[PDB]
Amino acid sequence: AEEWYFGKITRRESERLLLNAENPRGTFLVRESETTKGAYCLSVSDFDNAKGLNVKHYKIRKLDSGGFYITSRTQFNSLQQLVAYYSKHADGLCHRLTTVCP
Amino acid sequence: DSIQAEEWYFGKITRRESERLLLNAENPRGTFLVRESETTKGAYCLSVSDFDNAKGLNVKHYKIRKLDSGGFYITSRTQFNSLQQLVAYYSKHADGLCHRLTTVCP
Incomplete structure (x- = not known):
């Protein structure tokens, strides 16, 4: 399945997974x-x-x-297309998506 | 020490990495690992x-x-003196787990 999709984890867990190691800005994951x-x-x-x-x-x-959408600027026919997009274009997100959360 | 060298213990592998290893189609359901x-x-x-x-x-x-x-425990039903003992038990009895532990993750 998608290496960046972490499923049903809590906001707090996502923060600990993301901050567990020294990762580049833009390290990310998608979750429910x-x-x-x-x-x-x-x-x-x-x-x-x-x-x-x-x-x-x-x-x-x-x-x-x-x-799927985060804003009115773009929407995507799938969740991987959203991720693929913001990997190349930050557009209002704090950073473009770089490393998938280890 | 001993836990480090156990075939079923995978140390500090991450949550995502554990799923990368376990979701391989070779693995029967009940394939497992223990990690931090x-x-x-x-x-x-x-x-x-x-x-x-x-x-x-x-x-x-x-x-x-x-x-x-x-x-060590997963539920109030049973507690264990070691992780080796926990694995042994749940290899015999599912008791709340999705499955009995069958295959140690390669």
């Missing part, structure tokens, strides 16, 4: 949302002055038609 | 391969806690 049923979460590491090393979480929603 | 938990310090994880046609091959991860007396 804890707080919104049917939705997913893209959890991405980042570093900045205000927060230091931190993890940002983006909700991915699923359209009734089947597609 | 990445998310609870001091805990271990029993990772077991499973299957159902409404989901395919998938992995169940059970936390193993160590009691400060020295024991």
